[PDB]
Amino acid sequence: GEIEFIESSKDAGFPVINTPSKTKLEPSVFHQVFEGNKEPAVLRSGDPRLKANFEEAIFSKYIGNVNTHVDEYMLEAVDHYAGQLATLDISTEPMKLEDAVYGTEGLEALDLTTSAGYPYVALGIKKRDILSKKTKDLTKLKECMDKYGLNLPMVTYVKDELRSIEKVAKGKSRLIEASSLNDSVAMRQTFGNLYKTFHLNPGVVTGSAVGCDPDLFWSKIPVMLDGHLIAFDYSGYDASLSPVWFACLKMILEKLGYTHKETNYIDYLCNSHHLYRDKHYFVRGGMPSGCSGTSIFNSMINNIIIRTLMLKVYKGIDLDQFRMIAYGDDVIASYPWPIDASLLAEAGKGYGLIMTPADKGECFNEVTWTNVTFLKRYFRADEQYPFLVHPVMPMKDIHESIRWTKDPKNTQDHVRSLCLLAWHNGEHEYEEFIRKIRSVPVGRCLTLPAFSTLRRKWLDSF
RNA sequence: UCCAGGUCUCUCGUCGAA
RNA sequence: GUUCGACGAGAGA
RNA sequence: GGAG
Ligand SMILES: [Mg+2]
């Protein structure tokens, strides 16, 4: 992806937006209890912790575009993945507007607690001023879509979240692109049936993990990926994507049954326009993270990409024995024979992708069931029931979370939620976690679940 | 004086009235 | 208890 | 800009 052009929003008849410049995050009562290396991301150019230019840092992800055509490897990649998806019977018929907006099996309602994007954000207008799940009213919505139309600019915000202090110093904060309510609705009408079929079918046929519950899904993964493991990381995947990959996505969408007018919606993802503060800018390429379908489309593209690389690097690879599960850029895969991920990274480079060793490792060495991760979780077979597998989030990540709060009123919910992640590390580790929580006054006021109760509910869930 | 911060998935919690 | 609904939070991508 |  590449920022092609920047103009003042005033030139283009857009207002200055007003982007929150202060974190909601503050140290919690457990800040001194646990060790941690993360702090709230830099949100503004005048952050005292900055050791580099902030705006340069945040837009640096747009590394550029490769100018190459859809080659024979891509075509074969698209054909093979389209053949899997054909078994799922995805309807290309538009989703009913009420279902698209207020929810249906496999697809939750629009989030009414989030911004409505442009122009509503500059008009003081919220989603709740327009939509209500209690009434399921569409009258005010139809009228706002008629009035303001589609293909509105997305609004760039700096994401408020914890980051390593290294990334704080370099100002390497992440950006989100707020989709207009109108475009979210139009997207959901057009692709809603695809969305729900993916959500309902996580696994190696969609090549997607969206819709999964790691507590249950982790036990299925080794059954689905029974070959030699393949995993690697991407650097700035979303923003690294060149237009050729969107061209591929549109082709696979056509093979699914979508027409040109419908695939043209992808042009608004690939060739996108944005508001940041007092600027209006144009990006060619890059998946604008925050558009409707971000996860599904990033995952679909990841399925096209990794097939492409396999086919290019290894002639006589048999994709029918390839298995992969992607969640956006995150991926875990297998092939019956050892695949050199460093060679895939090499081919990836020519396609404008930056692929590095899994989990920020030093070399593209062997990926094993013991060291592989997915959705930041390790895999550990239950010692009692070896066919059941624990999703294991590292305690250090659980520690970073508990050390901060967006509101001390939520302490009970926050800490309970973390317990449900922590116990998969085992009873000893869990009790040490509970103990440190109980080492400060507030901790002793919390209702925390017993290890035995968690294990019991888990086994019961199967 | 106060508000402004995406798409989605999963899970937990508080409310439900069948 | 169980479903389905509305609201809050946490985590992941 | 929205609201009180
Ligand atoms: Mg990964």
Numbering used by the authors: 1 to 462
What's written in the study?
The replication of positive-strand RNA viruses relies on virally encoded RNA-dependent RNA polymerases (RdRPs) that are capable of rapid and processive synthesis of the 7–14 kilobase viral genomes. To examine this in further detail and to validate the polymerase–RNA interactions seen in the initial poliovirus EC structures, we here present nine new coxsackievirus, rhinovirus, and poliovirus elongation complex structures at resolutions ranging from 2.1 to 2.9 Å. All the complexes feature an upstream RNA duplex that is pinched between the pinky finger and thumb domains such that the RNA exit channel is opened by ≈4 Å as compared to the polymerase alone structures. All of the complexes show the open conformation for the active site wherein the β-strands of motifs A and C are not hydrogen bonded together to fully form the RMM-fold that is commonly utilized by polymerase active sites.
